[PDB]
């Protein structure tokens, strides 16, 4: 399924993911497109920072959900 | 019309605004009520940072809409 990741610079990234993918899996997919290391990425959804070890499903992230990305 | 402006600290203030008010006008009303100068305010609605030069109606901000305020 597709989700969106929006930056404060105005970019909208798309990722193909599964509900069981982990946050680090997501950050690696961002790295693959943007070159930003996962440890420089803060992902936000529903007013919460997303944590390593958890899945998208843990946060109720569903099809065409939008995450926000800020860089360290 | 009344709108609400909330911060991440949980405070919610009420403002009287018009559909044709510009974002900079709304920031001037926040300054009038809370004393926060406009260059310290970032206003957010429906996943966008509101841009000066546009009106509330341009963003489909309606009666009793809630905007988020982040202070810089």
């Amino acid at each position: 399924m597709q989700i969106f990741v929006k930056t404060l610079t105005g970019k909208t990234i798309t990722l193909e993911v599964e509900p069981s993918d982990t946050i680090e899996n997501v950050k690696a997919k961002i790295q693959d497109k943007e070159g930003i290391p996962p440890d420089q990425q803060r992902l936000i959804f529903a007013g919460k920072q997303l944590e390593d070890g958890r899945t998208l499903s843990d946060y109720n992230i569903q099809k065409e959900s939008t995450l926000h990305l800020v860089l360290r | 019309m009344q709108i609400f402006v909330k911060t991440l600290t949980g405070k919610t203030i009420t403002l009287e605004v018009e559909p044709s008010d510009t974002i900079e006008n709304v920031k001037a009303k926040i300054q009038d009520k809370e004393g926060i100068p406009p260059d310290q305010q970032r206003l957010i609605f429906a996943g966008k940072q509101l841009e000066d030069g546009r009106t509330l109606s341009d963003y489909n901000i309606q009666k009793e809409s809630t905007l988020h305020l982040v202070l810089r």
Binding site: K6, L8, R42, I44, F45, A46, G47, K48, Q49, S65, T66, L67, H68, L69, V70, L71, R72 | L8, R42, I44, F45, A46, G47, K48, Q49, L67, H68, L69, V70, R72
Partner: peptide, 18 residues
């Protein structure tokens, strides 16, 4: 710091959406 401000901006954007 800019980082803290950006985190707050992202939290608010995210909240305002969903």
């Amino acid at each position: 710091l800019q980082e803290e401000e950006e985190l707050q901006l992202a939290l608010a954007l995210s909240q305002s959406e969903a």
